[PDB]
């Protein structure tokens, strides 16, 4: 039976798993979404007249960068208890990744829902971003709004984009980042918690190698790429478990560890799930992870196929949308980007 | 219909194509092979007990280096008219690359055979080296003899190996090299006839980017990697033609231009097909070009597959082997390195 989110606005508990230092935690663990007594409605495919074209974060136009900053600022300006707010959007990640919900709707109220470290990883984050992007557009009255994506698979895209830097006056800034790494600028997709101290050009080569390993060498079939089968009745898979998919365990994890500030108790913000969403770059990194799924499929290789297991197809999550409606979405319905009315500008 | 070498001992003319300055040419254009009363026999797969392991030129054991040096010396000690001799082996390149032979056996007696600048590039040179290597081993009675290869895809291997340097007392030496470049040591795989005034570590990065360009970015399918289709009735494809494959037009060409001596009439030795084989490093560079073919398939990327067109499979050449027998070989028979009983020592 498929993993099924309950009414997250009626059945939710404080996040208390996967956070090593709760005593000194700098972000809240009260990550439950606002309870507005709304009815959960089924997803309907968008009727957008144009496709939203996500743009490389290092090659944005003035309007792209300006619109994005304005949208994030608007989001930061909302009171937290607005489900579209900066903090509410961050808490979504906390609730789904750090044990806010249980499998009660599947008859297992004794077991948490975890969307990480399994085949739920890609589709959950695809939906998370889908609503996030549409919410941002609505806040600035831009019906064709699109997120940037951090193109760390291309050399010019490997340095963290300057648009995220500066100080608090920049809405895309977050003080809780590894200061030494931000100075280095170039992300280490092979980062394992220890600085390599290698030449920049060698880091580029290392990063190109890492993307190849995650998309081709190790992502050879649906189980190795998406991650292990995870269904109702299953306990949460531990971080670093061998069954975790190639991208999630590889380049994905590396970027989070690299950006997260090691002087913080849980390496907040990016260094832990529960706090990652408080860094705007979280969503932009994840937009490229979302793109990795597209690239993996476009590689017409044996085994590079989508999942057909019903217990994956029928897994579902709940999100607030731009109208503050509650929407249930299914994995099966996000596999086709044309139907979600967005794509990525390549090069 | 496939390109088919004639009886090369019966139908052959002096090289007169692709040599800009024939008047001042420092090597002979009389590149035809010796006639020993042999008849041409079909190839048979070797029954070697062990696989010969080619070694990176910058990391040879004392025995590997001493054996190679002894073998080349023995080849230089042979009179030129021996088909196994240093000069005979060099002339093979001249005859196949500078218009020694015609397509007479295909019914086109007024068109030359050219093995460069098409899909014949990789398999012709694989066979050329296969016999060259087995001849060398025979001259020193080492049944498991293997060539070195110039591993310029790895930083440590990018400097031309010191084994090729010194003076004429070293059999691996050739005076007709770009003296300034030999002093620089680090090959420029992007060399286009103008010295780059850049630091060594940047040249390393340039070289990495070039190997990535040739094997991944531009070698996207058999046509783009191996080069354009070339069959009986086709005229010779020009150097620099758009249809030339990625490795041949790229890193391959750069190394030849870089090592060739610009003070010579045709940039002899490496700077022109007709003279390149007079430099021992020619074969060792080409052994890594041979390895690029292996690497390209091992990448297991989409389109990285061998050619299946019969007009490629059934194309053939004629070489002398270590028994001074004439052997006809076909492209189809060199695609599997296990059956040719050699491979490469990898990291």
């Amino acid at each position: 039976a498929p993993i099924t989110a309950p009414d997250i606005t009626s059945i939710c508990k404080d996040a208390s798993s996967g956070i090593g230092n709760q005593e000194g935690a700098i972000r809240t663990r009260k990550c439950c979404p606002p309870s507005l007594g709304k009815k959960i409605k089924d997803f309907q495919f968008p009727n957008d007249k144009k496709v939203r074209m996500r743009w490389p974060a290092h090659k944005g136009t003035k309007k792209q960068v300006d619109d994005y900053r304005r949208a994030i600022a608007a989001m930061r300006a909302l009171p937290d208890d607005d489900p579209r707010s900066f903090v509410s959007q961050a808490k979504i990640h906390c609730a789904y990744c750090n044990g806010g919900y249980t499998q009660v709707d599947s008859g297992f109220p004794d077991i948490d829902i975890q969307i990480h470290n399994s085949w739920l990883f890609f589709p959950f984050h695809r939906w998370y971003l889908y609503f996030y992007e549409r919410i941002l557009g609505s806040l600035i009255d831009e019906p064709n709004f699109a997120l940037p994506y951090w193109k760390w698979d291309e050399p010019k895209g490997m340095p963290i984009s300057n648009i995220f830097l500066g100080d608090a006056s920049n809405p895309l800034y977050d003080q809780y980042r590894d200061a030494n790494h931000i100075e280095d600028r170039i992300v280490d997709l092979d980062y394992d918690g220890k600085d390599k101290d290698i030449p920049d050009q060698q880091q580029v080569a290392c990063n190109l190698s890492t993307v190849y390993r995650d998309l081709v060498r190790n992502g050879v079939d649906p189980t190795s790429f998406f991650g292990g089968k995870y269904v109702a009745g299953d306990s949460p898979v531990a971080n670093g478990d061998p069954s975790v998919g190639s991208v999630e365990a590889g380049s994905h994890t590396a970027v989070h560890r690299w950006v997260g500030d090691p002087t913080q108790p849980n390496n907040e913000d990016m260094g832990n799930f529960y706090s990652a969403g408080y860094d705007p770059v979280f969503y932009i990194h994840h937009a490229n992870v979302d793109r990795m799924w597209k690239l993996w499929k476009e590689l017409r290789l044996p085994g590079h196929v989508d999942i057909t297991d019903p217990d994956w197809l029928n897994a579902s999550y709940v999100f607030y949308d731009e109208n503050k409606d509650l929407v249930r979405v299914y994995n099966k319905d996000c596999v086709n980007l044309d139907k979600l009315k967005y794509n990525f500008i390549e090069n | 219909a496939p390109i088919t070498a004639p009886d090369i001992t019966s139908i052959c003319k002096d090289a007169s194509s692709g040599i800009g300055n024939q008047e001042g040419a420092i090597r002979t254009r009389k590149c035809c092979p010796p006639s020993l009363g042999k008849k041409i026999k079909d190839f048979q797969f070797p029954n070697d007990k062990k696989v010969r392991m080619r070694w990176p030129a910058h990391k040879g054991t004392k025995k590997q280096v001493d054996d190679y040096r002894r073998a080349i010396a023995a080849m230089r000690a042979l009179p030129d008219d021996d088909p196994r001799s240093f000069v005979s082996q060099a002339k093979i390149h001249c005859a196949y690359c500078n218009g020694g032979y015609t397509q007479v056996d295909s019914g086109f007696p007024d068109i030359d055979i050219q093995i460069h600048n098409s899909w014949l590039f990789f398999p012709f040179h694989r066979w050329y080296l296969y016999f060259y290597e087995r001849i060398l081993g025979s001259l020193i009675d080492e049944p498991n003899f293997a060539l070195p290869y110039w591993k310029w895809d790895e930083p440590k291997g990018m400097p031309i190996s010191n084994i090729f340097l010194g003076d004429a007392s070293n059999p691996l030496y050739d005076q007709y090299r770009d003296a300034n470049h030999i002093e620089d040591r680090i090959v420029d795989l992007d060399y286009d006839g103008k010295d780059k005034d850049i630091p060594d570590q940047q040249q390393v990065a340039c070289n990495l980017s070039t190997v990535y360009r040739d094997l991944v970015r531009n070698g996207v399918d058999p046509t783009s990697f191996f080069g354009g289709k070339y069959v009986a009735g086709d005229s010779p494809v020009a150097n620099g033609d758009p249809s030339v494959g990625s490795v041949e037009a790229g890193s391959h060409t750069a190394v030849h231009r870089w090592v060739g001596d610009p003070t010579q009439p045709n940039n002899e030795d490496m700077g022109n097909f007709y003279s390149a084989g007079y430099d021992p490093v020619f074969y060792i560079h080409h052994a890594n070009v041979d390895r690029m073919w292996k690497l390209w398939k091992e990448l297991r990327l989409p389109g990285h597959v061998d050619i299946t067109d019969p007009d490629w499979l059934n194309a053939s050449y004629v070489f002398y082997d270590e028994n001074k027998d004439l052997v006809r070989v076909y492209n189809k028979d060199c695609v599997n390195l296990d059956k040719l009983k050699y491979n490469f020592i990898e990291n």
């Binding site: 060698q202 080569a205 190698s209 | 990535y212």
Partner: peptide, 12 residues
């Protein structure tokens, strides 16, 4: 990996 030899090795 890919076309690169141990590019992530800090001790190359």
């Amino acid at each position: 990996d890919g076309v690169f030899t141990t590019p992530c090795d800090p001790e190359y």
